[PDB]
Design a protein around this ligand. Structure first.
Ligand SMILES: COc1ccccc1-c1nccc(COc2ccc3cc2C[C@H](C(=O)O)Oc2ncnc4sc(-c5ccc(F)cc5)c(c24)-c2ccc(c(Cl)c2C)CN(CCN2CCN(C)CC2)C3)n1
Ligand SMILES: OC[C@H]1O[C@H](O[C@H]2[C@H](O)[C@@H](O)[C@@H](O)O[C@@H]2CO)[C@H](O)[C@@H](O)[C@@H]1O
Length: 516
């Protein structure tokens, strides 16, 4: 499917893709291998769709947070650089691209949002978010505004949501508690309510997106913006006398931007893996390769120690690293995609008045917890049905929901299996199962049959009950190790294809209510 003898690269439209194409031309000069750089729209959503069919680019560039989901789906080649190459990059950047103990991408650069201000309009930028309404009123008297930034991508609003205590997945004792989501706590609510109040008081407009905020800052209409290092090139061209500084505090606490490490992963379906490794290690991740990209659109604090020693002297890079140290390195867990979609919907709905801050963040919490809660219920049902004994481990966060959904699932699911016993036994024969490969083919049939019909709790219970019927067969045929991957496969198609409907039902609470 992917053509051998060439390299196709995907990178976001806000990065230095013309600089990257200059590195590709240098590679072609030596090897005769043509390198095509593309920047398709929504490349981070297109990549898992096309790479799953054996298609897509040879190399994908994105911040490290999406890569764990790609790796979990088997879409990325494991990268194994030698120690001499590994030592040329900062160890924390390699940590950002490690998933299940394996390196799944090459780190390129460390990105963090900073406060960018027009020194000619605002010689002393604000230290707090609280003083921005009064500053906006003062600036409005002169035909200017205090601040405009992209309100359509939650990445830009997150530093404010996290400032007073909001968090994505709790991190404590050197580990993430995936069961602990903090998008709907008092801290997140205060941050988002402050943003909504800025919009209600006409200090910001809910429709402001990336282009609008960028045009207004680069034309001197707004005194401040919130953006990353890639934006500096267009501000340079505009000749605005700008500064790059620490984000304002909220309730006396620093804004905490989610820090991304721009990384390059190699498609598992690529027949050009050795060419991609040579391109990335020996052409791109060199002082000259990174300089070519950086001159087009700044990368931020690069992962390559030798080049970073020079960039670190730039006060804009010092400000980027200061904001990064006050924030957090993004997790790379597979549910980051679901978290981002949920928080993106929450900020847009709260900003537009479609939902209150409380309704918006409650839905964001349900969406962010959906995979873990669904896995807990489905995994426990399949394993207790197969072995005849329940899991003694504590249910954890939202244990009441899990326990009640499991009790409901025992009552309804058992009835489904009892009434359709002969029909399920017949289907189990056609799907000849005796090993791990036979479970993977069953999964493919499940995904299509479930995805084809109507969305309702009856069909969801059928999908899970048939999975329990199969897990019983796996226990007797001494293939009990296939049960947990089957539970993960059922959970994945359920949370991915029925995401919106699930959240509208208040997740598993709606299931308990429906069958009450
Ligand atoms: C108010 O409703 C409820 C309330 C409480 C609780 C439940 C409900 C409620 N709701 C909605 C459907 C239901 C019963 O669903 C069954 C139950 C046995 C069957 C077919 C269905 C159809 C149903 C659907 O697509 O709607 O199936 C699924 N729904 C969701 N995910 C899924 S995944 C999935 C599946 C999984 C693995 C696989 F390799 C193939 C398919 C199926 C399914 C599915 C489809 C079809 C068949 C089976 Cl065994 C299954 C389990 C066979 N099929 C036909 C028999 N054949 C015999 C011979 N004859 C000559 C012709 C006829 C029997 N129960
Ligand atoms: O808005 C959610 C979005 O945030 C991050 O995307 C950033 C990206 O890291 C930056 O390099 C730059 O391009 O801006 C993006 C936001 O528009 C996450 O990396 C991404 O996965 C997430 O969807």
């Amino acid at each position: 499917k992917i053509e051998e003898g060439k390299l196709v690269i995907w990178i976001n439209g806000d990065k230095g893709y013309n600089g990257l194409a200059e590195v590709g031309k240098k590679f072609e000069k030596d090897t005769g291998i043509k390198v095509t750089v593309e920047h398709p729209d929504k490349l981070e959503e297109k990549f898992p769709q096309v790479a799953a069919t054996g298609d897509g680019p040879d190399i994908i560039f994105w911040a490290h947070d999406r890569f764990g989901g790609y790796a979990q789906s088997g879409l990325l080649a494991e990268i194994t650089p030698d120690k001499a190459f590994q030592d040329k990059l900062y160890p924390f950047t390699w940590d950002a691209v490690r998933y299940n103990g394996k390196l799944i991408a090459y780190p390129i650069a460390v990105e963090a949002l900073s406060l960018i201000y027009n020194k000619d309009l605002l010689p002393n930028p604000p230290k707090t978010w609280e003083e921005i309404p009064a500053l906006d009123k003062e600036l409005k008297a002169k035909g200017k505004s205090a601040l405009m930034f992209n309100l359509q991508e939650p990445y830009f609003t997150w530093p404010l949501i996290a400032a007073d205590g909001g968090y994505a997945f709790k991190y404590e004792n050197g580990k993430y508690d995936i069961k602990d989501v903090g998008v709907d706590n008092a801290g997140a609510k205060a941050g988002l309510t402050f943003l909504v109040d800025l919009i209600k008081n006409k200090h910001m407009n809910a429709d402001t997106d990336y282009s609008i905020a960028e045009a207004a800052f680069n034309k001197g209409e707004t005194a401040m913006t919130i953006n990353g290092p890639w934006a500096w090139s267009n501000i340079d061209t505009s000749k605005v006398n700008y500064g790059v500084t620490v984000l304002p505090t909220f309730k006396g606490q620093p804004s905490k931007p989610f820090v991304g490490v721009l990384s390059a992963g190699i498609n598992a379906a690529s027949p050009n893996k050795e060419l991609a490794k040579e391109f990335l290690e020996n052409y791109l991740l060199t002082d000259e390769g990174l300089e070519a990209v950086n001159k087009d659109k700044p990368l931020g604090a690069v992962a390559l120690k030798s080049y970073e020693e020079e960039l670190a002297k730039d006060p804009r890079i010092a400000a980027t690293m200061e904001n990064a140290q006050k924030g957090e390195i993004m997790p790379n867990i597979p549910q980051m995609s679901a978290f981002w979609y949920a928080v993106r919907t929450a900020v847009i709905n709260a900003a537009s008045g479609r939902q209150t801050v409380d309704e918006a963040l409650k839905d964001a919490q349900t969406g962010s917890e959906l995979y873990r809660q669904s896995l807990e219920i489905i995994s426990r049902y399949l394993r207790e049905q197969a072995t005849g004994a329940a899991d003694t481990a504590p249910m954890g966060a939202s244990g009441a929901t899990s326990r009640k959904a499991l009790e409901t699932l025992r009552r309804v699911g058992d009835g489904v299996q009892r009434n359709h016993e002969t029909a399920f036994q017949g289907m189990l024969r056609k799907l000849d199962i005796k090993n791990e490969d036979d479970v993977k083919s069953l999964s493919r049939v499940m995904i299509h049959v479930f995805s084809d019909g109507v969305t309702n709790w009856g069909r969801i219970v059928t999908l899970i009950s048939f999975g329990a019927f199969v897990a019983k067969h796996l226990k007797t045929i001494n293939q009990e190790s296939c049960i947990e991957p089957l539970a993960e496969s059922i959970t994945d198609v359920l949370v991915r294809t029925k995401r919106d409907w699930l959240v509208k039902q208040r997740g598993w609470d709606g299931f308990v209510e429906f069958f009450h």
